[PDB]
Design a protein around this ligand. Sequence first.
Ligand SMILES: [Ca+2]
Length: 75
Amino acid sequence: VQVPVYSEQEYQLYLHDDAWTKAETDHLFDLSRRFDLRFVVIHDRYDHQQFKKRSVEDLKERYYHICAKLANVRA
Ligand SMILES: [Ca+2]
């Protein structure tokens, strides 16, 4: 499986979360592409200058909830 790519419109309409910025979400997806979805590595390399402490499970939940939402809105 590949990392999904969402458009700006898809993010605005369907992917916002009160506790996540689009910048952080884009960072998570960029690291997921660069580090082959190895969440221990993504977690270790996360930008903690800009973004708060997230657990590995928090990163996975964000990534996988976006995957499920995109699957539904693209159907
Ligand atoms: Ca990759």
